[PDB]
């Protein structure tokens, strides 16, 4: 299967400088152009540039002339885009993307995107709270206070609670975020049965599973 | 630095029974004393914190006591599976630091040891070495005696002798006795021979092999 | 650069009905324009090539028309699962340049929220901080104000609030607030209130507990 | 689930540095205090120093001072202990530990522990030979000896774990720069030799796994 | 593998038959001599008799001759042992059971015995109750009214096998009840669920009970 | 072996068992030495006998030790007429007995 498999998040501190990669996996890597876009948050989508991997040749947007330079590695199939002299307005999520028209349908593949974070503050990994009721139904929650930077993925049951999931977007206070999630359940499902929130924050390498236990 | 002196490096008990080890504070630590178990070959595992509140997990059988300089691990209806090194530890001044650690043993009936011989592995005979094997297991007590005869003649160069810990089961003691020579002297003699000395027996044990 | 416009920033439907949006380019672009959706957290995803022509797995649903100046993609039969930002996109000259993106709204019928309260957690006051939560769930219109009681007096600070987007299911919204306070100022109280006010009645929505 | 993951040897030349590495995963990484015990082979446990990978904050033992030095990277949620200009007296197992009081119990959790071991000395991989029985009762005793090797430790297991009962892993004795021990595991003799019996040897500070059958 | 198949329980009228029946698998079935032994619940051990599935060749005891019956089905690899007018004497557990000596070791092997109930009370499957409350938690689970013997009683579907105390049943107007206890650390319960698993066969009843706060 | 004084555990009746008129509220004597031992049960202070079932296990085949389970059952509106219900065990390791025992309320 066509994949193009993107970091998570890259914490840079300002002034320093930044490489993005791009690995591409299931088909001729040297075969289509790989594009750049970067998107800041709350904002729209803007083009970097795109590369054909094949001789490295290379169209740029002129705003993003000396501060990305894009690059490829053909022994390992990977794409990079190099970010320098850092600055707030550099932090952005940056997707790679690559078009595919094989004579009978056109297909698009992109990147998760990379959320890369231009500050001069540390990581902190999240502290995941359970939230347990002091009807038919039943809402639990789980609250992921205070990590940086962004982003963490909350899912329930490793994914297999789906239905009736609110996630709320993350909030920054105090230089550090957090959110919460909520999960509405048939009462006979809770707590007869195991409901797990797990979190992932991949800028600390931290995956936290933690049931919703009574009380 | 704090001085936590467990007054005996070992204690003894029957399984069943109960066991009580203490610890002796320099100075008054308050309740900030905490004990260990460690079992052979394993990383320590926390028992007690505040003097006698046990860490989840522990039974009840381990209780704690004391308040001040004077403190006490007690272990009830012990088990084989209790043999391990225990220590006490004072956190309440900085440095944090530790007891000497009290071996826990367990006291049974004498157990004659069961004794097998092994000639040299057909693989080693290819490196030029030649290993004899001999294991005497689940003898009790601990106190035993191999003699290598080769060809009845006593051979004690190149004798290679490990104790095992009490076993975490029937509670007794097992050695492996090793007599390592070259692949031309192995085969300069016929008669090989592991003969164990224990207080279960007047006569010893013999278990032999003939090179052929 | 060519520069798309996209003069609406927000477009209103209900479910089953249908919406447009316009794309204005400064410059002919001929019919090299795309289109692109996005939904909240995730990657584009590319609806429409070559003005009209859809990539695979986009539904009829979506058309794209227009050609020279005046682009437009028209959603039909639209539902809930359609709630993203979509972007216009030209790519006749270089730079390649977008639009600023226009997001779905779908209206429906006024629903009150369901409110759940949640007191700080053991593992919590162990940290020296104390949360209580207060998740107030598939509600609509978004607007809605929620305020914090202690002991009977309000407290307006050390909150976060944070709404979800439009649901993906019902076309609702919904809404977490926390209130973040010391262990120490915690024990020091007992009770405990969430109040919620929105449209759909003038009586507000209260939950509590006890300590 | 906590865990804390430390690599199982290292082997360093004499007055030369290491770094022991203890990876944390499944809690907060930030949010509890890392503690670092010693201990020399056959000796007691010592305290090293204890550091909290929120802010760095460290209590050492006086005595350690200048011999270790404790880091952590938030970023992959490691802990480092730096040792340096290392001597005979700095071969030990070093331990990282943690303890999580989440409002109703209270958990300890500990690293395997890194056995150090500082000597001039290189690598040797163990020789694992079979102890079968001598040719021609209702059980039968079989052997494994794990011969020549350096540094420790070694991993012995039988049928890679299944065969747990009967089993004695002797104590390593050191001759000549060189370690060795022995393994028995006694079955029935329905089991034996009708069925195999695997001596299952692990050697990392060689990348050494070696999977022995004890064949009649 | 050689294992001997009972069925685990058999509920007949007083003065009927029961058809004990003994699946052989693993070896040839005409090669050995087929035991049968009779046990009363909490009495020791008697031979009924023995067969042989070659030629159905039997030795029978005085005391169960007019009682018992030996046959086999070839075709099938199983052993039969009929007992007929049966009486509140004949409740009891009966075993199938061969020796094999196969030139270097002797091997016992043994079926887990089917015990026979002589009752005009009617099978009634049991309910199983949670039993929901420092460093352990002892939980329990009770099973309760249950007809006839036996029940199986697992924790997390044997996964959970240490500090499990499960205690024999009590007889009270033709029902059993019996219950079986736990004790598991402090941060495996609440935190894991811990589940009761109780098998019925004689009711065709598997029941699995999740201890929940 | 060594005498050894019994782990008490009280459970009273879950809810479950209440919706079909039964209550059972059961007892654990866990890992006691010798057998010999006696459990009494108090309704409201009052030592009750009838409905009271007894089992005990065979001799732990780990720690040699014994264990019982004590089992009152009665009617739910037995049950809900009173609210103090107590489990008593005297063994020969101490004079005074343990006492677990949990109310209604
Ligand atoms: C900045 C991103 C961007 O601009 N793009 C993009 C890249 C990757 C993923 C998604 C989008 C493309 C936009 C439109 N395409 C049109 C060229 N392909 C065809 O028209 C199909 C040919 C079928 C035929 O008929 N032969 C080029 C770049
Ligand atoms: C050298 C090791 C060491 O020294 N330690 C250790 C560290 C990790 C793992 C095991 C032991 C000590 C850490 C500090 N203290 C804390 C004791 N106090 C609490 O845990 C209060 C919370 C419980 C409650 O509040 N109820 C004892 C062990
Ligand atoms: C009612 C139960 C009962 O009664 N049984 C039983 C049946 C099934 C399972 C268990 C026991 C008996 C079956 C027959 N066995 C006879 C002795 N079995 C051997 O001796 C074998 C060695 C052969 C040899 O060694 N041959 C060579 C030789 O010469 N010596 C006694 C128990």
């Known amino acids: 299967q066509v994949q193009l498999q993107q970091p998570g998040a890259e914490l840079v501190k300002p002034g320093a400088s930044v490489k993005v990669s791009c690995?591409?996996?299931?088909?001729?890597?040297?075969?289509?152009?790989?594009?750049?876009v970067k998107q800041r948050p709350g904002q729209g989508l803007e083009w970097?540039?795109?590369?054909?991997?094949?001789?490295?040749?290379?169209?740029?947007?002129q705003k993003f002339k000396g501060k990305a330079t894009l690059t490829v590695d053909k022994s390992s199939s990977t794409a990079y885009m190099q970010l320098s002299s850092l600055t707030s307005e550099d932090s952005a999520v940056?997707?790679?993307?690559?078009?595919?028209?094989?004579?009978?349908?056109?297909?698009?593949?992109?990147?998760?995107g990379t959320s890369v974070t231009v500050s001069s503050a540390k990581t902190t990994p999240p502290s995941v709270y359970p939230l347990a009721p002091g009807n038919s139904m039943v809402t639990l929650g789980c609250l992921v206070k205070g990590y940086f930077p962004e982003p963490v993925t909350v899912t329930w049951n490793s994914g297999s609670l789906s239905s009736g999931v609110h996630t709320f977007p993350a909030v920054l206070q105090s230089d550090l975020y957090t959110l919460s999630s909520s999960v509405t359940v048939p009462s006979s499902t809770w707590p007869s049965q195991t409901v797990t929130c797990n979190v992932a924050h991949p800028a600390s390498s931290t995956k936290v599973d933690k049931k919703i236990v009574p009380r | 630095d704090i001085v936590m002196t467990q007054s005996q490096k070992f204690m003894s008990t029957s399984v069943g029974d109960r066991v009580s080890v203490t610890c002796k504070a320099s100075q008054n630590v308050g309740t900030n004393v905490a004990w260990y178990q460690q079992k052979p070959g394993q990383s320590p595992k926390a028992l007690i914190y505040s003097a006698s509140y046990r860490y989840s997990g522990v039974p009840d059988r381990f209780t704690g006591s004391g308040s001040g300089t004077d403190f006490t691990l007690t272990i009830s209806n012990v088990q084989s599976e209790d043999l391990a090194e225990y220590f006490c530890q004072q956190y309440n001044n900085y440095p944090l630091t530790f007891g000497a650690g009290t071996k826990l043993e367990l006291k049974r009936a004498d157990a004659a040891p069961t004794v097998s011989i092994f000639p040299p592995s057909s693989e080693q005979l290819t490196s030029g070495g030649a290993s004899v094997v001999c294991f005497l297991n689940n003898f009790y007590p601990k106190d035993i005696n191999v003699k290598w005869k080769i060809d009845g003649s006593e051979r004690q160069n190149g004798v290679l002798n490990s104790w095992t810990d009490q076993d975490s089961k029937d509670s007794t003691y097992s050695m492996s006795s090793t007599l390592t020579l070259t692949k031309d002297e192995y085969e300069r003699h016929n008669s090989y021979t592991c003969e164990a000395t224990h207080k279960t027996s007047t006569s010893p044990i013999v278990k032999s092999f003939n090179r052929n | 650069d060519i520069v798309m416009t996209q003069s609406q920033k927000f477009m209103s439907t209900s479910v089953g009905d249908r919406v447009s949006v316009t794309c204005k380019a400064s410059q002919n672009v001929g019919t090299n324009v795309a289109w692109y959706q996005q939904k909240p957290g995730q990657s584009p995803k590319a609806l429409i090539y070559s003005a009209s022509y859809r990539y695979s797995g986009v539904p009829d649903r979506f058309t794209g028309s227009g050609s020279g100046t005046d682009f437009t993609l028209t959603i039909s039969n639209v539902q809930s699962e359609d709630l993203a930002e979509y972007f216009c996109q030209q790519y006749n000259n270089y730079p390649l340049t977008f639009g600023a993106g226009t997001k779905l709204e779908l209206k429906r019928a006024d629903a009150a929220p369901t409110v759940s309260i949640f007191p700080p957690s053991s593992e919590q006051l162990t940290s020296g901080g104390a949360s209580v939560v207060c998740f107030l769930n598939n509600f609509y219109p978004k607007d809605i104000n929620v305020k914090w009681k202690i002991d009977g007096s309000e407290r307006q600070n050390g909150v976060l609030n944070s709404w979800t987007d439009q649901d993906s299911k019902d076309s609702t919204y919904s809404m977490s607030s926390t209130l973040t306070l010391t262990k120490d100022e915690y024990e020091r109280h007992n009770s405990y209130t969430c109040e919620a006010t929105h449209k759909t009645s003038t009586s507000p929505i209260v939950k509590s507990f006890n300590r | 689930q906590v865990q804390l993951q430390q690599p199982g040897a290292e082997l360093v030349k004499p007055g030369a540095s290491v770094k022991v590495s203890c990876?944390?995963?499944?809690?907060?990484?930030?949010?509890?205090?890392?503690?670092?015990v010693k201990q020399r082979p056959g000796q007691g446990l010592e305290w090293?120093?204890?550091?909290?990978?929120?802010?760095?904050?460290?209590?050492?033992?006086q005595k350690f001072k200048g011999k270790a030095t404790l880091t952590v990277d938030k970023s992959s949620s490691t802990a480092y202990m730096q040792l340096s200009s290392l001597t005979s007296e700095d071969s030990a197992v070093?331990?990282?530990?943690?303890?999580?009081?989440?409002?109703?119990?209270?958990?300890?959790?500990?690293?395997?522990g890194t056995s150090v071991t500082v000597s001039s000395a290189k690598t040797t991989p163990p020789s694992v030979y079979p102890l079968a029985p001598g040719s021609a009762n209702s059980m039968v005793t079989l052997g494994c000896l794990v011969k020549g090797y350096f540094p420790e430790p070694v991993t012995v297991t039988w049928n890679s774990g299944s065969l747990s009962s009967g089993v004695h892993t002797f104590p390593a004795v050191l001759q000549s720069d060189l370690y060795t021990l022995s393994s028995s595991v006694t079955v029935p003799s329905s089991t034996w030799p009708s069925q195999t019996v695997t001596c299952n040897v692990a050697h990392p500070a060689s990348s050494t796994k070696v999977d022995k059958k004890i064949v009649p | 593998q050689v294992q001997l198949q009972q069925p685990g329980a058999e509920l007949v009228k007083p003065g009927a038959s029961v058809k004990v029946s003994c699946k052989a698998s693993?070896?040839?079935?005409?090669?050995?001599?087929m035991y049968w032994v009779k046990q009363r619940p909490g009495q020791g051990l008697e031979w009924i008799g023995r067969?042989?599935?070659?030629?159905?060749?039997?030795n029978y005891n005085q005391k169960f001759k007019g009682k018992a019956t030996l046959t086999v089905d070839k075709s099938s690899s199983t052993a039969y042992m009929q007992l007929s007018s049966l009486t509140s004497e004949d409740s009891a557990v009966y075993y199938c059971?061969?020796?094999?000596?196969?030139?270097?070791?002797?091997?016992?092997?043994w079926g887990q015995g089917t015990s026979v109930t002589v009752s005009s009370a009617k099978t009634t499957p049991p309910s199983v109750y949670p039993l929901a409350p420092n460093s352990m938690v002892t939980l329990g689970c009770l099973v309760k009214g249950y007809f006839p013997e036996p029940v199986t009683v697992t924790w997390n579907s044997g996964s959970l096998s240490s500090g499990v105390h499960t205690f024999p049943a009590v007889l009270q107007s033709d029902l059993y009840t019996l219950s079986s206890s736990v004790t598991v650390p402090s941060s495996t319960w609440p935190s894991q669920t811990v589940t009761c698993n109780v098998a019925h066969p004689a009711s065709s009843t598997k029941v699995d009970k999740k201890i929940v706060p | 072996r060594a005498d050894a004084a019994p782990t008490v555990s009280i459970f009273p009746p879950s809810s479950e068992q209440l919706t079909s008129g039964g209550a059972s509220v059961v007892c654990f004597l866990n890992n006691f030495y010798p057998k010999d031992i006696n459990v009494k049960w108090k309704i409201d202070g009052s030592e009750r006998q009838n409905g009271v079932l007894n089992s005990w296990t065979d001799q732990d085949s780990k720690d040699s030790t014994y264990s019982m389970s004590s089992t009152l059952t009665l009617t739910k509106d037995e049950y809900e007429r009173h609210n103090s219900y107590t489990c008593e065990a005297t063994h020969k390791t101490s004079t005074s007995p343990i006492v677990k025992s949990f109310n209604r309320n």
């Open positions: 067969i042989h599935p070659s030629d159905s060749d039997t």
């Open positions: 693993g070896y040839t079935f005409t090669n050995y001599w």
């Open positions: 059971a061969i020796e094999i000596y196969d030139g270097y070791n002797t091997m016992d092997y």
